[PDB]
């Protein structure tokens, strides 16, 4: 989690699409959905992103509408967004144990207990907070045994990204869990 604001440049497709999908959270606007393989994805936007901007106008207090109206409108040349980096979600370092374990239980993404003398017990690792990133990679919506999975093929550090499941709740609340495990790129970064 970058400490603060930048600015993306992005381009809509041939077919006028960019890969996202805001939601309106404390009159704010955030990051629900980006498309693998979008103009959104290779700029490198996330889940649980603010965009604070678009062209130069202040998003504070617009609908989940009016966000997605204003991306239709653009004069789709270049959009500009600023960008306040997933301010809801923290990132914490563990190292597996030689039984290559970090310390905790999940289920449906949300992490339920920390186990005692663990790196993530170690860490401070939370429960009630839904797992949003592995190693900068988005898992959102990946069953349990493929985040157990990316946790096994996992070198020895893992890099885990975690949202309050209130707030997380609240950002895919209208967004069916299939376009969730489908849809969101959870792929890694391009180079």
Do not use: Y
């Amino acid at each position: 989690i970058k400490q603060g604001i930048r600015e993306v440049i992005l381009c809509k497709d041939q077919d006028g699409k960019i890969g996202l999908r805001l939601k309106s959270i404390d009159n704010g606007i955030f990051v629900q959905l980006v498309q693998a393989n979008s103009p959104a994805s290779l700029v490198g936007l996330r889940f649980g992103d603010q965009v604070l901007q678009i062209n130069g106008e202040n998003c504070a207090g617009w609908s989940s509408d009016k966000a997605h109206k204003v991306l239709k409108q653009a004069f789709g040349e270049k959009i500009t967004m600023t960008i306040r980096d997933r301010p809801f979600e923290r990132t914490i370092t563990m190292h597996k144990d030689s039984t290559g374990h970090v310390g905790f239980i999940f289920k449906n993404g949300k992490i339920t207990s920390i186990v005692k003398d663990s790196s993530a017990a170690r860490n401070g690792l939370l429960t009630e907070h839904n797992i949003c990133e592995i190693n900068g990679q988005n898992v959102i919506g990946l069953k349990d045994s493929q985040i157990a999975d990316i946790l096994s093929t996992s070198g020895t550090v893992v890099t885990i990204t975690i949202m309050p499941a209130f707030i997380f709740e609240h950002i895919i609340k209208r967004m069916a869990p299939s376009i969730m495990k489908s849809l969101m790129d959870h792929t890694i970064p391009e180079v």
